[model samples]
Target: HHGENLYFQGMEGKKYTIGTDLTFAPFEFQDSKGKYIGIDVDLLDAIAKDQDFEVDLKPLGFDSAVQAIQSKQIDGMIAGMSITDERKKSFDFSDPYFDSGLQLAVKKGNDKIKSYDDLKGKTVAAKVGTESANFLEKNKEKYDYTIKNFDDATGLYKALENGEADAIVDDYPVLGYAVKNGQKLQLVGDKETGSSYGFAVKKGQNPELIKKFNAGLKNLKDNGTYDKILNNYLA
Candidate 1:
């Protein structure tokens, strides 16, 4: 029942319950007034509307959201998660909605680091469970850097801001958004660690639901709604 149970359950036409970690800025982070806003949040809202379905977003940490899905506490997730083979072992992923990659963020005038190579022997920080942290863990020796895992994106950025770490690595769009919003951080270079964004569902959930979601998403894109949402926040 593990591989396909979740899928069959979803096909039974039951109400789907989804959860997300609403703290990853420009993807799912809260606004100045503490309201959820971001690409993922707005995209899902459009999907729900187009599909005529109800979605419940739970403001949980990234790790906690993954655990909740694994425990069957939630049906799906769209937390700006990158599609990875390791994660597929625990949950299924929808078609990628965005292309992204890991990049380094440092203080505006930091000359100590000009690229990933310069991070060697330096303390680099990143949000736990993110692609940047994963890349750092896998390539620590190649980069020769000590990695500091933060609980959230903000914490990772703050570490760089306070000079606690040499740099921060995360999704490029998120880092770009932070920089645009006056984080005083600049990308080290045009390096991309390679990743794609997708939604997660319990490992064995409904193909029908996935089909519907994909179709609905396509419609949104076709009708210009997708670009509108992106411009509303990104522009």
Candidate 2:
């Protein structure tokens, strides 16, 4: 979204290349006017401002962004990406920002999926390489639900709308924001398998950048801006 490229132009600072996902709502996604405005978007925007740095944002979708980071094609990423030990091997993450989890949702007015038990023999959609997919795979046998992983949030939601998926499971906030934005889905099950979100840089790379991010994040939280962002998006 960094369309202006005007901020901090005079400062002789590193213009970092930051990658992110554009489909996960209330974290990183397009708005009504087709503009990026979400928790991660505003958070990074403010952090860059606070740190007096410039960032070239790449909203190249989640899967591609991850690969891009591995290839050293980007400086860092912030896409509501979860912080986990497994991820730590490949990337260093900032302190946990948002604690998030998954929720099950079905198209609005679809009362058949009233609870988890209703998922039996149903087709479910989850985003690939996400905690939701891992959770579904872990419990698929007991739940007896068939599962498919979509690479992007749009395709994940479209699966349910097109009858390809009886239900969709994803980050609770993502689902909430999508429904709030009129996606025609209603959350059903309780959120599960909580994880903390983070901003990340490839392991052993951009250590100084991570330091700036950490300091900026702490300052934002201290100044009440962080709370405002949370209230505005996830409240």
Candidate 3:
């Protein structure tokens, strides 16, 4: 038996507003029916219910969601954000939730680029303010690749298909989801070594909220809900 009674106290029944990315599918996204549903959506919902709290989700896209968190406009954010040393300066992150990495993709039927070595003098596109973008920038000089940044997945994918970029860098899962959903894209190389995703709150803010999240997450893992959530979207 768990000490369930001791855990449900001041935080119970409290409702929080959480921001997230609009189109990070398998994590957060709108389905065909326009319902916001994904791992992040369902996982957070389950945690809220298990912890006796409530949440209102806002699909504001990643950069805007990060801004909302920094301004305290939202109590938290969980849009597949990666935990990073640089971000640690401004935000307190929950325990790492998901392992993630960046990868290179090219438009389908293109084989000119087989590996990172083939990237010389080419443009690599990535969503703005993401690890993929940062990675592209960090390796630009060494790989001799130019960088192009887009605000969201729509534009990022479009840029590649329309020839605005020679290659694209993004979370491998996101790229995989796109290809699986028929986006005419192909992964060119293995994923770059990357970080784990985390729930974020502005530095030193929402301490109790983080505690509740951690407790609820542990509960989910112990009961097998976490794996079920992942299986629902990934096949």
Candidate 4:
């Protein structure tokens, strides 16, 4: 307990370097002026203000951000990263901020592929280092579909548009946001519900950071800032 107080005293007003995905719409993305802004960005900003701290946001790709955290190059990450027991072995997570899940999407008007069973012998794409990618990998053998991985959303969607891939899998909200934003894609099948997004730090490090994030998250919910943020993008 003594060390805890000491740590907090020393960490007061500290500026932490936070990592995020370059493009994961409605969560982390760049606006017209090249400014990074989205739910993760705004939420973390509010948390920082409420917690008496500051953050330096990094727009590293998702896979790079995870590597940065493991190598101690960043203090924390909040890229709508899902909370799972497997990830818990490598990182400590804050209270889940959003309930999320995987979804399959095919090109607009593609009536041929309506379900996982229809994916046989077709190429399915997902971003590298994402739960969607892992899910595809795990089920590829049983589903008898080929899996393709892209570095980011740009390539993933491009591949689908050009017929290089028959379908793609990603977080449900992200896919929904893409469709809402005029992307020529349509969701298929039921969402694989159960994943929850959380803020994370390398395991056994930044314990105070998680505490502060959780406390700030609760404060935002209490004051209604959380819902406001969500509605701005999702309503």
- Which candidate wins on TM-score? 4
lDDT of 4 by residue, 146-206 (tens): 9999988889999987878999999999999999999999899988846999999999999
The residue pairs in collision within model 1 are: 6-204, 6-205, 7-204, 7-205, 7-206
> Model 3, 1-235: lDDT tens per residue?
7646656545469889999997988799887899899998888999899888899888788988899899889999999999999999999999877899988999888889889999998999998899988898889999999889998888998997787998998898888888888888879988795889998999999887888889889999999999999998896
Candidate 2 on 1-235: residue-level lDDT in tens? 7576556644336799999986787888777898887889999989889898888989987877889999999999999898988889999999989999889999999889999899999998898887888889998998899999988887998887787999988998788788888879989978898899999999999988899899999999999999998888767
Where model 2 places Cα greater than 4 Å from the true spot, the runs are 1-12
lDDT for every model? 0.80, 0.88, 0.89, 0.94
Off by over 4 Å in 4: 1-10
Residue 226 error for model 4, in Å? 0.5
TM-scores, in order shown?
0.88, 0.90, 0.93, 0.95
Using lDDT as the measure, name the better of candidate 1 and candidate 2: 2
The true-structure Cα RMSD of candidate 3 reads 4.7
RMSD of 4: 2.6
The candidate, 1 or 3, that scores higher on lDDT is 3
Residue-level lDDT tens digits of model 1 in 40-112: 8898878877776767778777877888888888788888888988888977888888888877888888888
Q: Each model's RMSD to truth, in Å?
A: 4.7, 6.6, 4.7, 2.6
Candidate 1 lowest-lDDT run of ten:
5-14
Give residue 64's error in model 2 in angstroms.
1.5
